[PDB]
Design a protein around this nucleic acid. Structure first.
Lengths: 81, 322
DNA sequence: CCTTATGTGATGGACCCTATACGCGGCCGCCCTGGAGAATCCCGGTGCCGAGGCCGCTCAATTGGTCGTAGCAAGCTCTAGCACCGCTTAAACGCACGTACGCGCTGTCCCCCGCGTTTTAACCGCCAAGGGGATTACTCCCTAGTCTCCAGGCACGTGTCAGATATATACATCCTGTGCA
DNA sequence: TGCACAGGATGTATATATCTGACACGTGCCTGGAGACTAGGGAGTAATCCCCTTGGCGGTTAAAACGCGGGGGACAGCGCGTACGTGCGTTTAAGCGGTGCTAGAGCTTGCTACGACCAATTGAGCGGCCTCGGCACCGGGATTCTCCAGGGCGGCCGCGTATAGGGTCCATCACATAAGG
């Protein structure tokens, strides 16, 4: 796996921003958005993986993700809580 | 295009922004409170539109436009002036409208080189073979009017002619090579006729696609071991076409030869036109309704009035710029 | 046809007058010089009152024993994840045109800082308290932590009913030889 | 000759039916309520001692308020240049369902070893009290930064010396021609 930071593409950022109602966009936005997403994912994934490793475990379950997010204060409903 | 979308069921359609129908307008049957032509101005709008379009339409292929402004692009103006030769002033009729033109030649360099070679050959052939009379001045004048001066003697055949509007010197267009030219010796009038296709860009682009396909096929065959005419091709899109005809007046005998030599072999374009006439979709002829109802068409009437006002407001500045 | 010497008719050029740099001088941007002075720096140099040290002592950290059930170790088993196939688009991409948006610079003018004078809020000392509130303890007693039986109602699953999908049909939208006008 | 229609051909919106999801009804087990025992934390009771306003009052002070100048900050206009918006043709690999493996997850074990619970000791830690040196304030000489004035160069502007230069209007010039013999 390589260059997957690019894999998000521009059009995905476009559509997501479109949901946000932005009428006008700049080219530089994409790189910044990718960086923000990268650091967010890194933090969430580290929390989830440490939640997993506690349980003498190998498969990250949706419980690990949802409770990791809860520890980051971001509360998520609808996945078996 | 932004003109008010006509209310449903009006007895007219908006063609080119104006109320028109295919059939002859029956105001007396259709209108209860017809506004005067003065009130409507539809006729006025039509006339202004017609003239302007004739100044700017697609009849002749555009080739030069004055650049919209130590930029060296100024220095190119004399170069473009010199790349054409200057020729004398002539009148043109466009439908009910008439226009005036001065003539300009587009300098074919191959004709210059061939003329130098021909003078070389003639010189070598000749070497191998080997008060003041005003009436003479009049004879020279008449000779130069019906025979040819040097620039005309070189540019008899294959010379290139550019058209310009003396009321709008900003655009220059090519005289149609695919045109039928008739020189009336009795009236000194010249009638030009040509067929024009409204979706010609579509046909040219499909033509490019076909050319690419044929090139790809030839390349594929070569990997193992052309008068392309779009109008003949079976897969060509339907041309929306119009036939056009126009009369020139005021051209002098010597210029007629240059013009007469300039146009294409007649039978070939005739056959091409006949194909176009079988495959083409002819533009439908329709009638403008110059009178509108003050009540049902109030919005349309006022919109037209407003647009006319803006047009006139702009038109003064055009001479104020001179 | 030979054979003097120039008509034909513009693009190429010299000119008129324009307008200009700058001599001497000033407004001004600016280097910088320049002062006055409005702050800020660091070091006493001091007298105050808290940090922190010292002691009395008490109650809870530590100990040795017991009981018992929560975590651990397989380890049985089974289904959700992983991987490769391989058609089918369609979401990405390169590229073309333009246009309306962001930035650079404009002049304007109004409001909010720097500063001076007046007005208000607050404390000291008058005059020394009483009220009532939070902390502290004793004394029942009631409450639901506990084990246990009873019998269930709630959860896991299968059957049934509906919907979305599938495909005959009763003509629908037409082909085409040929007998009729 | 060309039209009317007798005889015949693909199709399809209409109509009849088959191919997938979700909800209600049946089993059946880890239960939830209930009965009775239980005690020690909650709640009712009683100081008790300490901290909170009295209450407005004058004589003051430090901070708040109000007034003013002005100058520069905000900000509405807008020339323009381009970099995102819209629209192609074209490619990728994201999506779809399919086949073959598995290893990681789920849980049932059988029971142990470590920690809940308990008397008893004792010393670390808290509560009270006492103190000199770490802190708090600023006086001073010195640092340093602010801001208008402005010496002086000279960008640019002013009176006007004399001067260098352009667009503007004038023409001179060449190819091959007009004429005589």
């Amino acid at each position: 796996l390589r260059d997957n930071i690019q894999g998000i593409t521009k059009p995905a950022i476009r559509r997501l921003a479109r949901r946000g109602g932005v009428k006008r966009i700049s080219g530089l936005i994409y790189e910044e958005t990718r960086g923000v997403l990268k650091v967010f994912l890194e933090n969430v994934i580290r929390d989830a993986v440490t939640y997993t490793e506690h349980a003498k475990r190998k498969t990250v379950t949706a419980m690990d993700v949802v409770y990791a997010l809860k520890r980051q204060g971001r509360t998520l409903y609808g996945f078996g809580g | 295009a932004s003109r008010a979308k006509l209310a449903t069921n009006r007895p007219f359609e908006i063609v080119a922004g104006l109320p028109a129908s295919v059939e002859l307008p029956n105001y007396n049957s259709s209108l209860t409170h017809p506004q005067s032509i003065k009130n409507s101005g539809v006729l006025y709008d039509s006339l202004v539109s017609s003239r302007r379009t004739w100044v700017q339409g697609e009849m002749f292929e555009l080739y030069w436009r004055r650049p919209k402004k130590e930029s060296p692009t100024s220095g190119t103006i004399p170069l473009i002036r010199d790349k054409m030769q200057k020729m004398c002033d002539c009148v043109m009729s466009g439908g009910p409208h008439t226009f005036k033109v001065r003539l300009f030649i587009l300098k074919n360099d191959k004709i210059e080189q061939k003329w130098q070679d021909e003078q070389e050959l003639k010189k070598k052939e000749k070497e191998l073979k080997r008060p003041k009379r005003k009436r003479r001045k009049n004879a020279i004048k008449e000779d130069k009017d019906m025979q040819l001066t040097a620039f005309q003697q070189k540019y008899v055949q294959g010379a290139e002619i550019i058209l310009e509007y003396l009321e709008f010197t900003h655009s220059r267009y090519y005289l149609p090579k695919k045109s039928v030219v008739e020189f009336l010796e009795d009236t000194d009038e010249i009638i030009i006729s040509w067929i024009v296709i409204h979706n010609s860009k579509e046909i040219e682009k499909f033509k490019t696609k076909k050319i690419k396909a044929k090139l790809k096929a030839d390349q594929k065959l070569n990997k193992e071991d052309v008068s392309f005419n779009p109008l003949f091709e079976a897969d060509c899109p339907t041309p929306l076409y119009t036939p056009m005809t126009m009369k020139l007046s005021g051209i002098h005998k010597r210029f007629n030869q240059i013009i007469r030599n300039s146009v294409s072999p007649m039978e070939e374009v005739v056959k091409e036109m006949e194909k176009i006439l079988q495959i083409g979709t002819r533009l439908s002829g329709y009638n403008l309704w110059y009178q509108l109802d003050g009540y049902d068409d109030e919005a349309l009437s006022e919109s037209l009035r407003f647009e006319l006002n803006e047009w006139e407001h702009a038109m003064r500045s055009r001479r104020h710029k001179r």
